Design an enzyme around this catalytic site. Structure first.
Site, mmCIF file in Angstrom:
data_model
loop_
_atom_site.group_PDB
_atom_site.id
_atom_site.type_symbol
_atom_site.label_atom_id
_atom_site.label_comp_id
_atom_site.label_asym_id
_atom_site.label_seq_id
_atom_site.Cartn_x
_atom_site.Cartn_y
_atom_site.Cartn_z
ATOM 1 N N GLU A 10 7.407 13.360 3.205
ATOM 2 C CA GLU A 10 6.562 12.247 2.827
ATOM 3 C C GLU A 10 6.576 11.854 1.355
ATOM 4 O O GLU A 10 6.333 10.696 1.031
ATOM 5 C CB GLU A 10 5.107 12.557 3.228
ATOM 6 N N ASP B 124 4.566 1.782 2.689
ATOM 7 C CA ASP B 124 5.377 2.661 3.476
ATOM 8 C C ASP B 124 6.620 1.961 4.028
ATOM 9 O O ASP B 124 6.846 0.766 3.857
ATOM 10 C CB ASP B 124 4.554 3.519 4.467
#
Ligand SMILES: [Cl-]
Ligand SMILES: [Cl-]
EC number: 3.2.1.17
Length: 162
Positions: free
Chosen positions: A11, A20
């Site tokens: 991540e 994202d």
């Protein structure tokens, strides 16, 4: 290697709001803030989340605090889910991390939709499950990370991450 180290690799760490891979407003270690276009809708969620006026920026500690919450939330949702629980109960310790990874990423509902794959994991048919998992939008969208997860399931070792 543990679930935290594994997710931190997959991540990243970002101390400032960002988008994202899907266009969503995110912060810290993969902590989704909102699916709304508004950068303001994100700044509000973010202060709500922290308990402070952040003005889209947070500290390390704060990103870590959110990370602890999310991992905990992911584990409890699996254990609370009628479809997920049996799979997890059936798995070894490494493969268990793989299921937590997917859940943190795609939520309980999404992972619960992989009916066939789940069934193959539960039957300990590693190769076949890995092949089925690959046939998904998930894999097509974030292939390197999906491949790492898939390999963890296929092998039962932390190879992909070392
Ligand atoms: Cl496909
Ligand atoms: Cl990727």
């Amino acid at each position: 290697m543990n679930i935290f180290e594994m997710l931190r690799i997959d991540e990243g760490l970002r101390l400032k709001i960002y988008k994202d891979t899907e266009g969503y407003y995110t912060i810290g270690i993969g902590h989704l803030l909102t699916k709304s276009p508004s950068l303001n809708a994100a700044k509000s969620e973010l202060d709500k989340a922290i308990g402070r006026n952040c003005n889209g920026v947070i500290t390390k500690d704060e990103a870590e605090k959110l990370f602890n919450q999310d991992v905990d939330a992911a584990v409890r949702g699996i254990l609370r889910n009628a479809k997920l629980k049996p799979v997890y109960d059936s798995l070894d310790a490494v493969r268990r991390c793989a299921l937590i990874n997917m859940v943190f990423q795609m939520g309980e509902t999404g992972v619960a939709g992989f009916t066939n794959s789940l069934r193959m994991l539960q039957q300990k048919r590693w190769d076949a499950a890995a092949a089925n998992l690959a046939k998904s939008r998930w894999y097509n969208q974030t292939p390197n990370r999906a491949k790492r997860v898939i390999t963890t399931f296929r092998t039962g070792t932390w190879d992909a991450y070392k």
